Amino acid sequence: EFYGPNRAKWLGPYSENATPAYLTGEFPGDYGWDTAGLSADPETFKRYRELELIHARWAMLGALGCITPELLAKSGTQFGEAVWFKAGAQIFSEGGLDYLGNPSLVHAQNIVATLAVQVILMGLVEGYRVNGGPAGEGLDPLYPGESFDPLGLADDPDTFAELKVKEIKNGRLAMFSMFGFFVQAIVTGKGPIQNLDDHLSNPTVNNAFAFATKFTPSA
Amino acid sequence: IEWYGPDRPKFLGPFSEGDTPAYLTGEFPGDYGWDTAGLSADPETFKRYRELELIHARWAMLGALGCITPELLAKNGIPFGEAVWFKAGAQIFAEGGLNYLGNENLIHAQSIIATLAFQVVVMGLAEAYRANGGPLGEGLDPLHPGGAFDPLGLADDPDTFAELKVKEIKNGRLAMFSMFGFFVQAIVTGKGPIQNLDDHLANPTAVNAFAYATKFTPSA
Amino acid sequence: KKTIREKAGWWSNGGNEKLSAFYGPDRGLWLGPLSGTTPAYLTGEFPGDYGWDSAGLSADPETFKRYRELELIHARWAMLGALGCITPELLAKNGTPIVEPVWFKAGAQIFAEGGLDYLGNPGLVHAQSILATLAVQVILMGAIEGYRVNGGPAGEGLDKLHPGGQFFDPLGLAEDPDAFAELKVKEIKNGRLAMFSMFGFFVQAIVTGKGPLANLDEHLASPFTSNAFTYAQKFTPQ
Numbered sequence A: 001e002f003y004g005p006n007r008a009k010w011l012g013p014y015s016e017n018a019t020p021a022y023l024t025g026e027f028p029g030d031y032g033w034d035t036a037g038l039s040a041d042p043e044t045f046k047r048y049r050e051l052e053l054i055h056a057r058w059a060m061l062g063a064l065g066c067i068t069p070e071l072l073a074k075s076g077t078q079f080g081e082a083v084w085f086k087a088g089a090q091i092f093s094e095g096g097l098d099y100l101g102n103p104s105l106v107h108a109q110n111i112v113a114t115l116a117v118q119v120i121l122m123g124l125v126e127g128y129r130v131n132g133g134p135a136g137e138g139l140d141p142l143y144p145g146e147s148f149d150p151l152g153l154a155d156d157p158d159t160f161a162e163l164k165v166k167e168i169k170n171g172r173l174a175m176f177s178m179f180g181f182f183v184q185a186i187v188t189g190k191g192p193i194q195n196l197d198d199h200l201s202n203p204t205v206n207n208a209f210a211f212a213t214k215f216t217p218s219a
Numbered sequence B: 001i002e003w004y005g006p007d008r009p010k011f012l013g014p015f016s017e018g019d020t021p022a023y024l025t026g027e028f029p030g031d032y033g034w035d036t037a038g039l040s041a042d043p044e045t046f047k048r049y050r051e052l053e054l055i056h057a058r059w060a061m062l063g064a065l066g067c068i069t070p071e072l073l074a075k076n077g078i079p080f081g082e083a084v085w086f087k088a089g090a091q092i093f094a095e096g097g098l099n100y101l102g103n104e105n106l107i108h109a110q111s112i113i114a115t116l117a118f119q120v121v122v123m124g125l126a127e128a129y130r131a132n133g134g135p136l137g138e139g140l141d142p143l144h145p146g147g148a149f150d151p152l153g154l155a156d157d158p159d160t161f162a163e164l165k166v167k168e169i170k171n172g173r174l175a176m177f178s179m180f181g182f183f184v185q186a187i188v189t190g191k192g193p194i195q196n197l198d199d200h201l202a203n204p205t206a207v208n209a210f211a212y213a214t215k216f217t218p219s220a
Numbered sequence C: 001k002k003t004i005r006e007k008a009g010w011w012s013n014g015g016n017e018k019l020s021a022f023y024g025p026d027r028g029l030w031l032g033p034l035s036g037t038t039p040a041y042l043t044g045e046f047p048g049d050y051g052w053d054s055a056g057l058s059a060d061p062e063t064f065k066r067y068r069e070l071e072l073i074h075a076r077w078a079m080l081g082a083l084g085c086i087t088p089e090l091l092a093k094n095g096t097p098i099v100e101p102v103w104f105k106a107g108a109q110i111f112a113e114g115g116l117d118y119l120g121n122p123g124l125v126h127a128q129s130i131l132a133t134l135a136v137q138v139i140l141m142g143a144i145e146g147y148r149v150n151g152g153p154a155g156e157g158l159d160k161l162h163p164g165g166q167f168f169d170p171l172g173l174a175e176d177p178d179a180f181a182e183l184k185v186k187e188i189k190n191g192r193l194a195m196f197s198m199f200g201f202f203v204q205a206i207v208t209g210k211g212p213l214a215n216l217d218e219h220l221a222s223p224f225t226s227n228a229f230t231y232a233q234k235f236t237p238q
């Protein structure tokens, strides 16, 4: 499974004609879901694959960077502010942005200098993604290797393709989780592990349907 | 009127002879020559987009019906608690629950989880049979099956089947545009669209949309 | 090899490398030297080709020419907007009595007592009803925007984006081939700048609620306290 014409598909047993003919099983996670036909052209398919994997890895990094201060708030450190949709306000505090609640570790003051250093590093490392650099030169722009794999888990090509489909499946689940974090931050106003604590406190009232009313206009 | 071929009724009339796309011939129902955005150049994107348009159309038709017939039907008789459509989901949380005709002996709907779970389970196989296969037919036209969907059989002659297709897509595009209107004129008034209709008919000059134009201006 | 006055560009007759940096494969790109693989369909024969189709929406050439049309029309509309958004505020800071010179509250001027005074003057436009204004707008704009796609009284068989006949190039700046090809990429770069600035006008009106020239003055007075980050706490979900 997971590659070829007899692979795992998005409808499963009901997925023998709805899958498009141009989604042949060579690329990872090709579950055959192009119901709007946007990746019919091969250049659109390649660019959307690049966008999907980069969005995937940014989403899983964002998922861990959002939930790990919540798990450490469960663990016992206080940081500057644990809530991820209130985490940017640590640099607006009086003590600044302490990293792990340690005032002698980051202690950031200027948000403008943070954005300047952030864009000066990120523009360089995002432009290095396109056309090689100190890490690589002319590799696969989605799977470079040889400088970002110090352990090098890409040795056997069958296990390499297995890790590819595992990565893209964890990535679709990660963008799913980050979209959930986005639309349950705005309707609840509490952190996501805190929403897990509400849903584990009473599972039948602390749902999305407790807050399913608040977005009516009402003049 | 022809609704097909090169001399079809187009979306700009006289202003539609240089705009008209070369990939958009007089084949499919409702082709007024409107692809100014350029999103139907390859025919399988056009196939998925025609499928998307017809499914959105056939959903927005019943959406407009389920919008206005509670409010109109409450205007005639049969009173409800929340007769408007966009508070209609809140009737589950009522002390008497959502009822179909409002009377207490029909359904007694207090749970939102059971209804959502049941409709997800049945529409999984329903929309999966819509995608492909199914006990009512597998390899038919996926947009226009017929067979076990036509008890009356109005698709007999290809001419009246074609004109039924074009009036289907025209009523559906009208329903999608009007459902967009329902969506936006719910949120700028907070009041029902039939009640918006009586508010417009009471004062056409100053109870129109422009009375709610200064509503969405940002503060501070 | 080359003397000092040629390096400054004194002589505008021997400039043939002017279109070499905006057309052809040896042109400037979007990430500069950090953009190696230019998309193979963006060959640089069109104005504004910085090799940027990262989402890949313009791989097909028909979609690409429709997107070029949409880009130039949005560019000219946003250019007229970004000129027509700040200039009421500029003339209010001049001293011309425009009563609501911010662009995001100028539509509500027609719901005032005295209607819509144009330059703050009743001798001007003095339009009262929004209904007849929108009616003559949709009639005039229907006629003009329907003349746009397939020709009309100001040109019939001309180009759909650059007609340039006796009505749309009356001053005659685009008579020369190289000057027209240079001012095409000048037009689309000024239009992309104004599209970005109109998006900035939209977001600045949404999250601040003040004037864009008021935003410019509140950034000129305090740059480090009154940045975009002091309004970053305005959409916190409670």
Ligand code: CHL
Pocket: A008, A009, A010, A011, A012, A013, A014, A031, A172, B120, B124, B125, B128
């Ligand atoms: C056999 C039954 C079966 C069916 C019917 C489906 C179909 C589905 N699979 Mg699935 N699969 C099935 C089995 C299997 N799948 C997979 C592998 C996968 C993968 C990898 C993926 C899927 C995904 C999906 C979903 C894609 C369609 C969609 O996005 O929903 C469209 C319909 C809705 C969203 C309706 C939602 C229900 C409800 C009405 C919502 C409530 C509405 C709100 C109240 C309205 C909002 C209000 C206002 C404010 C906006 C859908 C649930 C994809 C997915 O998860 O996307 C989300 C996906 O990535 N499947 C395997 C392994 C081989 C299966 C095994 O048999």
Ligand code: CHL
Pocket: B009, B010, B011, B012, B013, B014, B015, B032, B173, C137, C138, C142, C143, C146
């Ligand atoms: C010759 C004159 C003629 C004119 C002017 C039009 C006009 C139009 N027809 Mg057409 N038609 C015409 C002839 C004919 N039409 C049709 C049958 C159809 C159909 C079936 C359809 C059209 C549609 C259209 C529209 C397509 C272009 C567009 O999207 O505008 C874009 C520009 C605008 C919409 C601007 C107008 C709105 C307003 C002035 C601006 C709003 C400003 C807001 C305040 C800003 C919003 C606030 C922000 C914050 C959100 C356009 C409005 C399509 C349509 O209805 O799309 C909606 C459509 O489906 N026509 C027939 C029968 C064969 C014609 C016969 O000659």
Ligand code: CHL
Pocket: A119, A123, A124, A127, C028, C029, C030, C031, C032, C033, C034, C050, C192
């Ligand atoms: C070699 C270095 C170099 C770098 C790093 C860039 C960078 C860029 N150029 Mg380029 N250029 C570079 C060389 C050159 N450029 C140009 C000429 C141009 C032009 C004409 C254009 C560009 C554009 C771009 C952008 C294209 C990608 C994009 O849209 O990012 C978008 C993503 C980001 C910028 C990152 C996100 C911002 C922020 C850091 C994170 C979010 C912060 C918030 C706090 C989040 C909160 C929000 C919440 C609420 C959701 C990108 C910023 C285009 C542009 O301006 O697009 C905007 C464009 O039109 N360049 C020339 C002349 C030939 C160059 C010569 O070397």
Ligand code: CLA
Pocket: B177, B178, B180, B181, B182, B184, B185, B188, B189, B196, B197, B199, B200, B207, B208, B209, B210, B212, C131, C132, C134, C135, C138
């Ligand atoms: C075709 C279906 C349809 C119908 C029957 C109506 C009918 C109505 N709408 Mg709805 N509306 C529609 C589509 C529709 N609209 C669409 C597609 C949108 C999205 C742009 C809206 C957005 C909208 C808002 C935001 C509001 C209304 C309101 C109203 C009511 C007053 C009319 C008004 O203010 O004009 C609004 C009309 C539009 C924005 C465009 C509708 C398209 C029409 C059919 C074309 C114009 C033809 C017209 C007769 C000639 C105008 C001449 C001149 C003024 C230009 C009226 C009951 C207002 C209300 O609730 O009143 C109390 C209100 O607040 N509507």
Ligand SMILES: CCCCCCCCCCCCCCCCCC(=O)OC[C@H](CO[C@@H]1O[C@H](CO)[C@H](O)[C@H](O)[C@H]1O)OC(=O)CCCCCCCCCCCCCCCCC
Pocket: C121, C122, C123, C124
């Ligand atoms: C080959 C033909 C070329 C023709 C070119 C076009 C010429 C256009 C002339 C101006 C026409 C504007 C009139 C608009 C309708 C107004 C109706 C009305 O009620 O008026 C009312 C107005 C008076 O109204 C007053 O308006 C003022 C404006 O600030 C004040 O607000 C006063 O309070 C108010 O009372 O009457 C006039 O202004 C008529 C004057 C017309 C002549 C103005 C001088 C122009 C002379 C040189 C022309 C140069 C031509 C080339 C430049 C244009 C190139 C495109």
Ligand SMILES: CC1=C[C@H](O)CC(C)(C)[C@H]1/C=C/C(C)=C/C=C/C(C)=C/C=C/C=C(C)/C=C/C=C(C)/C=C/C1=C(C)C[C@H](O)CC1(C)C
Pocket: C052, C053, C054, C055, C056, C057, C074, C075, C077, C078, C079, C080, C081, C082, C083, C084, C085, C102, C103, C104, C106, C107, C194, C195, C196, C198, C199
């Ligand atoms: C390139 C690329 C590439 C890759 O690959 C992909 C991607 C990313 C997708 C792409 C991108 C894209 C983009 C960026 C877009 C954007 C756009 C915009 C911003 C526009 C604006 C736009 C804007 C606009 C139009 C504007 C306009 C304006 C107007 C009309 C006017 C207005 C006004 C004025 C005067 C003032 C008054 O008081 C009123 C009003 C009326 C208000």
